Structures are given as C-alpha cells and as structure tokens.
Write a protein that binds this DNA or RNA. Sequence first.
DNA 1: CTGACGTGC
DNA 2: GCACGTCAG
DNA 3: CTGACGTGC
DNA 4: GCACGTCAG
Lengths: 297, 298
Amino acid sequence: AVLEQFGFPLTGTEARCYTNHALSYDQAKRVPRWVLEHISKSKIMGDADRKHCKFKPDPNIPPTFSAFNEDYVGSGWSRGAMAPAGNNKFSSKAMAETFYLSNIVPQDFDNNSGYWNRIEMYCRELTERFEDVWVVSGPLTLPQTRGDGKKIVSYQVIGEDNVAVPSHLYKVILARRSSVSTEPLALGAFVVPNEAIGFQPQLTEFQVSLQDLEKLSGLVFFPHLDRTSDIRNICSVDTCKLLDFQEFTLYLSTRKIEGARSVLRLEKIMENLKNAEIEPDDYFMSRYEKKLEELKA
Amino acid sequence: AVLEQFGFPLTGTEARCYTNHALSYDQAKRVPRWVLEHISKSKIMGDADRKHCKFKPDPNIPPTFSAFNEDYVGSGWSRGAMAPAGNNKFSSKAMAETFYLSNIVPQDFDNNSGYWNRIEMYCRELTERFEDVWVVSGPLTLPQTRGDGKKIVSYQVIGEDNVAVPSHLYKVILARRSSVSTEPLALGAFVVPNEAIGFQPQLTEFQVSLQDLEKLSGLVFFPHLDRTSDIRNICSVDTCKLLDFQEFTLYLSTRKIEGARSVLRLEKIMENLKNAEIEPDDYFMSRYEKKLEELKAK
DNA sequence: CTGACGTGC
DNA sequence: GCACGTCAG
DNA sequence: CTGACGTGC
DNA sequence: GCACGTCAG
Ligand SMILES: [Mn+2]
Ligand SMILES: [Mn+2]
C-alpha cells in the first residue's frame, strides 16, 4: 500500500557469498553477524600465502557502514578474522577475501594468536576425521549480571566508525563423517571470552548448547537441519582436544621453517624453539634440515 | 556449493506488515529495529479505544525470540510503542497490533508520557498541513565518551529474555504536501535520549541529519526517496514546535474528562487546572459541564 | 494522549 | 493469573 | 599458524 | 602515510 511508497528501511543483513565463505554484515556495529565456512582436507592445502594479502574495506559494503584500517590501527585491538586465512590455502582469491574487514572483528591479540587460533587449528584437524566440516563464527556482546540482579551490556567501540568490540566470540562446528555415512552428524557450539586465555581451559569449558547460543545471538544456525536426524555432541563423537603448549610451539616453529627465506632466521627459529623446552620428535628436524639444505644453494 | 548444505543462519530481520504499520524485529535485543507508519487525517479519526487492547507478544514472532510482559512489569521501564495507538483511531484491528510487543521497547515513563508523546502529537498535527506523513521510529544504543577518551556502549537488559533498553529513540518524519503537488518533500530526523526531557528543549535541539542517523542506526531510511531532488528541512517548511505546557496540560485534561468515572474525579481535573493557573478554553468547559451533568446521576 | 497497578474471579 | 477498574505524567 | 610494529619516500 | 622487513604470541 501507500505505506511502502518510499520503501521499507534497509538493514543490509542479506547473506554475502565469497569464494569459500559467506557472511551477514552488521552495519550498525561494522562487524559480521555470522561467517559461515566449509572446510575439507583439500581446501587447507596449497601455496596461497597471506604475506601477499592486506586488510582492506570490503568494496561490496557501502562505505558509510564499512570499517577501515584506521579504526583498528592504534586501537589496542587486533584485526580478528572469523573465516581464517588458514582455511583457504587452496586459492589466493579465497584467502585474500578473508582479509576484507567485512570478515573482521576487534579481537584481543593473545586470544587471536593463541586460544582462538588453537580452536581454528582444531577445526582443520577435524578434516582428518570428517569429510566435511561446517563452521559458523561471529561476535557477541553479552550482558554481565551485577550483584543486585541488574543485567548490563557494555562494549567498546573503536575508531571514527565506532567498530564494536565483542565481549565474546562464538563458533558452531558441524561435521559430517562422509556423504554416504549413515553415522550421526557431530555438532558443537562454543562461546569464548574476547580476552587472553591460557592453556589450562579445555574447549569443553566453553561449550554451550546450540539453543542457548541462538538465544544469545538472535540467530538460528543451520535451519535446514533435520531435527530428527541423529545429531551428537561433537565432544563425544570426537575429542575437542586443543593443542597443548608443546605441540602448539612445535607447529608454529614448523610453519616458521617453511617460510624461512634466509639461514639466519632459520637459526633464530631453533633458538626460540629450544628454550625453554622442546626437543623435536617426530618431525621438526626433518623439515629443518630440508630447508637448511635448500637455503645453502 | 556445499557451503549452504544446511542453510545460511537466519537473522529474522525481514519486514513484517500489519494493518497500518510495518517493522523489522531484532531477535537478539527483543525489540524492533525500525517501525514505519503512514499518517493521514483520516487515520487519526475514529472510535478505536485503548481500553479494548492489551499488551501481548506478537503471535508471528517466534516465542524463542519474543519479549513477554513479564520482562517489563516491575522492571522500572514502561512499554513504549513505536507506532503509537493514537495514530490508529480509524481501526481497532490496527490499534490492537500496536500493542504487540514486537512494536514495544523499554522506555522511560516520563519520556513516554511526556516529550515522546508530544513528538507523536506533532506528527499527527502535521496531517493538518500535509496530506501524507510517513514516520520511521526505533531504538538506539549509542556510545558515550568516557573521561579516558574510550567510547563505551552500555545499556541494561531486563527480564528473563534480556530485552534491550535503548539509550535513545529516533524518529524520521517524511511529509508530502499532496500527491500531485510539485512542492519538495519535507524531511526531519530526530534523536531523543530515553529519559525525562521536560518542556525546556525545543524539538530542533534533537534534530540530526539523515546521514548521521543512518550512520548511527545502520539503517537506510526511505531507500526509494529521491535524495538528489530538492528535499526541505521540515523544521524550515514547518514549525517543529511541540505543544507547550499549557496546551499540553489542557489537551490531557480534555481527554481525562471522557474517562472520569466519578463526580469527585471529574472535579479534580478542573481543580488541577485552576490550581496550576491554567485557563480552561470553551471546548473543555462545554465538555466538562456535559460530563458533570451525566455523572451526578450515578 | 501516554502509561502502570490493584482487585476479583 | 488475566480482566478490568483505578490512578498518574 | 595468528598478528602488530618500526622504518622509509 | 602506506609498503615492507622484522618481531612476537
Ligand atoms: Mn584470527
Ligand atoms: Mn509511547
């Protein structure tokens, strides 16, 4: 009728498809509401290198509602990708699209480089055991209850564009053994506080029911999912075991080997590795000698 | 590809149409993001009465994401309609739908019955001078700059369902003189804090540019409105003048005549006027003597 | 006009 | 616990 | 792997 | 001020 003569207000929440992920953008907060990615063992292999990528505004987002690097730099918060670059080694285009700020939230540096990175590495590990893995990640601004029962949502906004800093990050993991497998699906929802987290807390300490997360986020995840199909807790069908300090430090050092462009850096890697722990079994020396061998050329 | 194998997440932000308004619901905050209404002379006349209406959850909203009266009662916040009941005198069906909690936000009681009430009455007043008036209303949670330069958004959530309490309320007013007139349209955008305001601040003190409001709300208002055509500031073409204390009080006293159930309550309405040294006009006096004659036969 | 609150089925 | 009469800004 | 930071034109 | 080498979790 005449009510829509000049159109309904636009919220800009429609799904946006990229090479290897999709997202819904929150124009008021300058961050994604959710970012959906599909992981398989083929996608996490390849020569795509993030050194040739740089954060930038998503051109498909109206500049009025876009975040800009000026909002993050100097803010005290790191640019935290929801769809990580590590899941897009198969395509330079796919990886570069993860560096769109439409995929980024203000994230604690330690959290970004530590616990959240470890969760991301677990999702990649799942592809060694499940043919297909679906992951939805996004930010949350949860309330905190005072001693008198009053509940308050408090979160910082940074930059000229007031980019919302989430209090928590969520991750919903859906895994299917194989296309023909009559085995149940594995499902897990996790909510992590946007702060430094050590190596003591297991991932199950941050596990929540999907229903609780849907009430906290206002989102319905995987709506096409058959509610009577056998779905099991991913931490019962699998391990939900993140890497401990020793494995984590070794994996970082191994990745640093493959990128060592000089021999002097190769020595620094070993010095950092060896102190204050770690003798590499089964595997860091085999790749250390190989890179040392080639670099002599 | 297999990316959408089980469907994309659902935000539930699609426009929902009712008899005389439309809204987009915020499932995470349990309040509407925006509520659009169209006002005309005909729509604000009629016999529809609030006494036949009750606040209830919107049946079209998934209960998982719905607010409930239990969230509001005893919270210290009033239920504040975005599309007001006063704009739906023409239809009891349309008025009942404004009491769906999908149209409601937690609102300061004084602001709700005072300053915001007066802005709504100005929107109805505009139909005396414009054939058609469109109004978009909704909540805002704006940041506050702290002493250390940090910018913090901070708002309360109330009830078992964590209904978000907005820090501000916005209203965008679009007015067209006539369907055939070549006169530019009149546009105004306003942001009012969710607190008691009083009669000192003029409405223009709360005016903002449409682009500022869109930047703050993350919404694009009236996307089919030709913004490159000449559009006039409504406070320049019109008055943007809310009722002052005397007019407001006299208008409330007039409405209260109709609802007085006793001769003692009707006379107190006249007493509070004269005790405030407000002079009753003729329509009030005539309406007052009519009701008084009819109440002394109880 | 805008609302909440106490009473009684 | 709602429906409804009462009371306030 | 995840990132920021210091330096140079 | 960005581009890029260097550095840190
Ligand atoms: Mn990250
Ligand atoms: Mn109201």
